Design a protein around this ligand. Structure first.
Ligand SMILES: C=C(O[C@@H]1C=C(C(=O)O)C=C[C@H]1O)C(=O)O
Ligand SMILES: N[C@@H](Cc1c[nH]c2ccccc12)C(=O)O
Ligand SMILES: N[C@@H](CCC(=O)O)C(=O)O
Ligand SMILES: [Cl-]
Ligand SMILES: [Cl-]
Ligand SMILES: [Mg+2]
Ligand SMILES: [Mg+2]
Lengths: 455, 188
């Protein structure tokens, strides 16, 4: 019955900077335990780490079917998966007001895989489906643990007995597992020669006017043993990426070291921050300073970026309040441990009759990892990439009961399933792209991740 | 007040929607295979805009038929692919440019006519195109309104009817005076 609009009850825990990894350690083996981590990054959009587990409802989408699971009820539907997600959110009857210090007040959290985009556009079926992991794997949570690095506050919130949730958390124990070890070398799904053939086919499409940009990716695979959580602890420290995440799913684990925000909806203010443009970090600090200026002044990288800025204005423009779409920032350089990136910022407003779930449906998957025009680019990706992307170049994030949302692009993200680990790497092919430079750009983005796991 | 925007499966169409809505237009967006001519007659749009898109006018669904049927009946604006389609509809030819221009601005010179009424000359505009209208086969019913530095056609307008094309994107974040350009089509 009773709709709840009351703000959730909050217990403040001891401030420690490592609170999220500390508490998550005892949860990391549970299916539907999830961590969003800001990577301890010194970054304008690194503030929050969020921990959930023990969902009240789960949503699992494989192709045309979504399975909605709740304590004594399992339902299957062919309906639009984001429409079904919004229905499940509404039926929870938890409707708190926005709190700028608690941006997730319970709600939906999980994975929107790249192949969920097949529900939103009609796409060909050439690339092979060789990973069985859901297109959507989302929990509904009536509590959360929020770490706020700006206020130095750890908040445990619940809509249903926060003291009982605190005692549940204290009762969970971190009984550590064997360390992570790779048990094979990394191997790609394509040779240098195959990559070359595919690069040249993209350039034929650029010159024929089929497309203006296509993101072409390869995939590295290895076997592994030991605990995926231990791998993440090592990677998170080293990557300092503000949109990182660890998901324990029924089918395997997602280890995301993404530096990329897809879409934020914060009190109806929309933000998207497409990353397009890359150079490697150089070890000499004087040379590395010059490297940042080279990327900022690169004409090829500015074209690659601008095209995605106009595409994201379009994608947000499908739902934004008329006149609200703005570009406050073009071509800022952000340094990360492996690479310098060029990032731009687009803002807009969400209309009151729409939901963040409608904004996700209008924009998914990100133009920054497809290209332009997006439908044609996604057709070319399916034609040239030997396997479907699955979790990689999808999104992780939350849709709060208050209406807020935040999402990543799952670049720099590993999939750990059935003792196999997969790590993909791509880049935007445009008219001024060169074959060897684009091949090496894929390695520049993930070489440090691949090499850290070999030890 | 009612503008029908034909979407050629493009990733810039909704920038045109946003600019026309900001100007106070009511805008309906339909994909190029989601409508028949009969459907358009029942909707009774005041004007039609043909969006940008991938490939050539032959792959643009209903766009060529809409141009041929409503020519002289309702004002039509063609943007990039829409401009190419307008030239092709009256017997012009769409050919590869000397240099593709994708996410690059260019200064264009114009005659201050059609949608260039009141705009500064030259005008810096964003290009997203591999193809151009071949100048030799441009139908006699069209005046060239704008040129690139290498004398590529950047705009055309019909001598008799409200039927006008631009090769560039007025709605790009780096194009100059794109709201005013589209306002000319909306309010004239
Ligand atoms: C697909 C990737 O590349 C994407 C495109 C970039 C580029 O091409 O410069 C940079 C960031 C990413 O949005 C990747 O990170 O693996
Ligand atoms: N960096 C975000 C929170 C965040 C961390 N990892 C994420 C992954 C996906 C979405 C959001 C996040 C913030 O400070 O608010
Ligand atoms: N695809 C065409 C039209 C682009 C716009 O629209 C070209 O490359 O010229
Ligand atoms: Cl469907
Ligand atoms: Cl801190
Ligand atoms: Mg690049
Ligand atoms: Mg509603």
């Amino acid at each position: 019955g009773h709709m709840k609009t009351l703000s959730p009850a909050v217990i403040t825990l001891l401030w420690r900077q490592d609170a999220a990894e500390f508490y998550f350690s005892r949860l990391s083996h549970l299916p539907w335990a999830m961590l969003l981590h800001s990577g301890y990054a010194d970054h304008p959009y690194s503030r929050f780490d969020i921990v959930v587990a023990e969902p009240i409802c789960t949503l699992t989408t494989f192709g045309k079917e979504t399975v909605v699971s709740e304590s004594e009820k399992r339902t299957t539907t062919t309906d639009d998966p984001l429409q079904v997600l919004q229905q499940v959110l509404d039926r929870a009857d938890i409707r708190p007001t926005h709190n700028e210090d608690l941006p997730f007040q319970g709600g939906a959290l999980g994975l929107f895989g790249y192949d969920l985009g097949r529900r939103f556009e009609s796409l060909p079926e050439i690339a092979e489906q060789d990973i069985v992991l859901p297109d959507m794997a989302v929990g509904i949570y009536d509590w959360a643990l929020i770490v706020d690095h700006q206020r130095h506050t750890v908040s445990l919130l619940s809509h249903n007995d926060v003291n009982a949730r605190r005692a549940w958390l204290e009762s969970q124990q971190f009984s550590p597992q064997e360390d992570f070890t790779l048990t094979s070398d990394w191997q790609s799904n394509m040779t240098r020669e195959q990559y070359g053939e595919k690069f040249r086919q993209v350039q034929e499409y650029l010159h024929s006017g089929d497309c203006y940009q296509v993101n072409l990716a390869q995939r590295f695979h290895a076997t592994y043993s030991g605990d995926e959580w231990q791998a993440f602890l090592q990677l998170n420290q080293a990557n300092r990426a503000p949109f990182s995440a660890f998901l324990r799913l029924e089918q395997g684990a997602i280890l995301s070291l993404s530096p990329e925000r897809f879409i934020l909806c914060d009190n109806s203010e929309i933000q998207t921050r497409p990353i397009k443009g890359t150079l490697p970090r150089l070890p000499d600090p004087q040379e590395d300073s010059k490297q940042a200026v080279k990327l900022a002044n690169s004409a090829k990288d500015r074209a690659e970026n601008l095209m995605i800025v106009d595409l994201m204005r379009n994608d947000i423009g499908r739902v934004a309040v008329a006149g609200s779409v703005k570009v406050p920032e073009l071509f800022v350089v952000e340094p990360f441990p492996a690479v310098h990136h060029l990032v731009s910022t687009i803002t807009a407003q969400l209309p009151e009759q729409l939901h963040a779930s409608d904004l996700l449906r209008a924009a998914f998957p990100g133009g920054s990892i497809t290209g332009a025009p997006k439908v044609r680019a996604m057709e070319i990706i399916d034609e040239l990439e030997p396997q479907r992307r699955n979790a990689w170049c999808g999104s992780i994030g939350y849709l709060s009961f208050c209406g807020n949302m935040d999402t990543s692009i799952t670049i720099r993200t590993l999939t750990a399933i059935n003792g196999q680990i997969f790590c993909s790497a791509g880049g935007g092919i445009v008219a001024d792209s060169q074959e060897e430079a684009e091949y090496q750009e894929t390695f520049d983005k993930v070489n440090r991740i691949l090499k850290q796991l070999e030890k | 007040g009612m503008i029908l925007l034909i979407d050629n499966y493009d990733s810039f169409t909704w920038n045109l929607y946003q600019y026309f809505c900001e100007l106070g237009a009511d805008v309906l967006v339909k994909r190029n295979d989601a409508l028949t001519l009969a459907d358009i007659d029942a909707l009774k749009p005041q004007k039609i805009v043909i969006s940008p898109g991938p490939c050539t006018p032959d792959e643009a669904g209903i766009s060529l038929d809409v141009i041929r049927h409503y020519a002289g009946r309702l004002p039509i604006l063609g943007v990039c692919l829409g401009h190419q389609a307008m030239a092709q509809a009256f017997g012009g030819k769409v050919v590869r440019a000397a240099k593709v221009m994708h996410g690059k601005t260019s200064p264009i010179t114009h005659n201050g006519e059609g949608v260039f009424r009141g705009l500064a000359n030259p005008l810096t505009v964003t290009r997203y195109h591999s193809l151009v209208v071949e100048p030799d086969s441009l139908p006699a019913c069209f005046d060239v309104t704008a040129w690139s530095e290498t004398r590529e056609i950047m705009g055309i307008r019909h001598r008799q009817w409200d039927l006008e094309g631009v090769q560039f994107h007025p709605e790009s974040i780096l194009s100059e005076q794109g709201h005013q350009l589209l306002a000319n089509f909306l309010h004239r």
